[PDB]
Amino acid sequence: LTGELQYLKQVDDILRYGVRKRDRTGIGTLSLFGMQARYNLRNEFPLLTTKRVFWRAVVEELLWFIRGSTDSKELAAKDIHIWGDLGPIYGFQWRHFGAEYKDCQSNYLQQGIDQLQTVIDTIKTNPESRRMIISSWNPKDIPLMVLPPCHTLCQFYVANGELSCQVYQRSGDMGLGVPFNIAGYALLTYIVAHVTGLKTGDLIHTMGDAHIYLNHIDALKVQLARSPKPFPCLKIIRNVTDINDFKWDDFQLDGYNPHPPL
Amino acid sequence: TLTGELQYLKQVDDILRYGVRKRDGIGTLSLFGMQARYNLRNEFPLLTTKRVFWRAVVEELLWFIRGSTDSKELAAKDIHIWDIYGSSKFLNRNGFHKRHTGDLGPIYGFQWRHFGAEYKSNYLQQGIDQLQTVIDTIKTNPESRRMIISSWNPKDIPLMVLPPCHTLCQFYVANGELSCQVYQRSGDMGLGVPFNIAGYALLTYIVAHVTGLKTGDLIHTMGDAHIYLNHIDALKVQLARSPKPFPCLKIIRNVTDINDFKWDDFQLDGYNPHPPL
Ligand SMILES: O=c1ccn([C@H]2C[C@H](O)[C@@H](COP(=O)(O)O)O2)c(=O)[nH]1
Ligand SMILES: O=c1ccn([C@H]2C[C@H](O)[C@@H](COP(=O)(O)O)O2)c(=O)[nH]1
């Protein structure tokens, strides 16, 4: 209903009423189109307690997006291998849109249209805007990527002071990806809400085709067997007025008492 | 679960009850992250609670599909919805004084057919075709999560006379059924929200026609979903009105090309909305 129980029954949606569809690997998936969720960013943070979610990959991948560097090796230095040059990925699109790409050894600042900042600039000036958006979809660059963004874009909305984010994710797996990126885009709200000096209202998670791999069924069926435990509430120690100034040590996650994974 | 126009009205209701007031001097009631499903199987989601302009919906898509950014072409057919923005009083107000009558900017139809083109004339072969790439892909790989048409081009956004309100859609194919989900950043429950529902549900009806598919659903996802404070009193009398059965959209001509589509290829069986007030 209100919480992780949205997601947790999104599995019981696709494991029951889910439709047979095929995966780009060629493995079978159970699919569903057009889901939606609302996760509460006030008083708490939505990190999955049903299965332990990788937190510091969630944190380091983001700051890697805020940097604008598309590379494996930079994040592999954090002992994070989840990702040479991936091409013009989110990190590029966020900070530079419509800028000619060579590789990430080239400096892409000064160029494109920086979305992340243009969202920030617009929040402190225009109290109300529906046009504040970060788009990861550029069909010209896309063929140059190692993979099209599963997260097409986000949009920000402010009412009575509290910031809300909706992220449109065209495709996600319930076992691996969406739990990860739930934290990921709920993480960005906290950040931009911080700079703009606003609060955290809600995170709306919108999914296109949402599947479950036919391996992950029983694994997912073990997970739902577990009563979810109370979400964490996140704190930001150092108050930062720049977006590229955020790093790991400014983050303290309290209240994570997940279950043994897999 | 609702799945109907009953949902749309439930949004209006949940907006009107719980709406938060955001003043632009014209304030509205606003909520965020609304999603509604509209069944496209054996009915057309044309809203019956109040009459939607049909020939406008039909003529805009063709105007979208062929890539037309020119509003004069809709007016010659006496569809005037877009002719305000191509009106000289509007273009010279906003700094478009160098742009001529009917010139809107790169907009949906342009971004659809040519993405990353350079707006001026004849753009054929220029930019990326978002529409023809989806129909080609549905033929080749009906299972893909990568089929999307996005109108957002922040580089070209300032060129646009108005930024795209429906910023992109996605297509999904299963059971020989073609579906669609449009993300709308902003929509007005009283005027334009029901209007797009027709345009995209028609495109799905079109694309399913070209690809040889059926129509599963149209999922309408809204960004800020708002009611201007002045539509309220007039709106709530549309609340007590109970929506009727959806009409029957059909295509009497088998059309192998999406540019070959004409206003004369459809017939609506069973559409009878409520009178005004
Ligand atoms: O945050 C993420 C990132 C990636 N994926 C996976 C799901 C799909 O298997 C795949 C997308 O590949 P395509 O369907 O676009 O080919 O990425 C997720 O589920 N969540
Ligand atoms: O399909 C549409 C097209 C336009 N609008 C109206 C609503 C807003 O008043 C305005 C967009 O406002 P901004 O996003 O530019 O702030 O267009 C809609 O509601 N639905």
**Which H helix or E strand runs over A135?**
strand A133-135
d(CA A251, CA A170): 29
CA of A31 to the centre of ligand 1 (A): 13
Q: Which H or E run includes A173? A: strand A162-173
Calculated CA dihedral for residues A96, A101, A105, A109, nearest 10 degrees: -30
B168–A137 C-beta distance less than 8 A: yes
Q: Which residue has the tokens 């999904």?
A: B172
For residue A88 the two structure tokens come to 């013009």
Q: Residue B157: which of A90, A133, A99 has the closest Cα? A: A133
> Taking Cα atoms as reference points, which of B81, B98, B263 lies closest to residue B165?
B81
At CA A140, angle to CA A136 and CA A143, rounded to 5?
A: 85
Cα separations in angstroms, B113 against B62, B70, B160: 12, 14, 15
Q: Which among A23, A52, A34, A3 is positioned nearest to A223, based on CA atoms?
A: A52
Phi-psi region of A160 (alpha: psi -120 to 50; beta: other; left: phi over 0): left
Helix, strand, coil share of chain B (percent; to 5): 30, 20, 50
Residue A222: its H or E element: helix A216-223
Closest CA to B34 of B223, B206, B209: B223
To the nearest 10°, report the CA torsion of B120, B124, B127, B132: 140
Beta bridge partners of A48: none
Residue A116 forms contact with B (CB below 8 Å): no
Give bridge partners of residue B177 from the DSSP assignment.
Answer: B174, B214
Task: Name the token pair of A246.
Answer: 């955020």
Provide the token pair at A152: 């097409």
Give the nearest chain A residue to B19 (CA atoms): A159
Report the DSSP pairing between strands A35-40 and A133-135. Answer: unpaired
The rounded distance, in Å, linking the Cα atoms of A71 and A87 is 8
Q: Which of B39, B42, B44, B45 is nearest to B217 (CA)?
A: B39
Look up the CATH number of the domain holding residue B39: 3.30.572.10
**Helix (H, G, I), strand (E, B), or coil: what is residue B22?**
strand
**Distance between start and end Cα atoms, chain A:** 24
**Cα–Cα dist B21/A193, whole Å:** 20
Regarding the beta carbon of B192 and ligand 2, being less than 6 Å apart is answered yes
d(CA B87, CA B102): 6
What gap in Å lies between CA A213 and CA A173, rounded to an integer? 7
| Angle, in degrees to the nearest 10, between helices A177-195 and A5-14 | 150
Q: What's the gap between Cα A118 and its chain centre?
A: 19
Q: What's the residue count for chain A?
A: 262
For A131, the domain range is: 1-262
Which chain A residue's Cα is nearest to B179? A33
Question: What end-to-end distance do the CA atoms of chain B give, in Å?
Answer: 29
Nearest CA among A185, A144, A122, A100 for reference residue B155: A100
Backbone angles phi, psi at B14, to 5 degrees: -75, -25
Running DSSP on this structure, what letter comes out for residue B13? Answer: H
Cβ–Cβ < 8 Å for A85, A104: yes
B25 at A interface, C-beta within 8 A = no
**Six-digit token string for B99:** 């742009």
Phi, psi (rounded to 5 degrees) for B205: -65, -35
Say how many C-beta atoms besides its own lie within 10 A of residue A219's C-beta: 14
Q: Per the structure, how many domains does chain A have?
A: 1
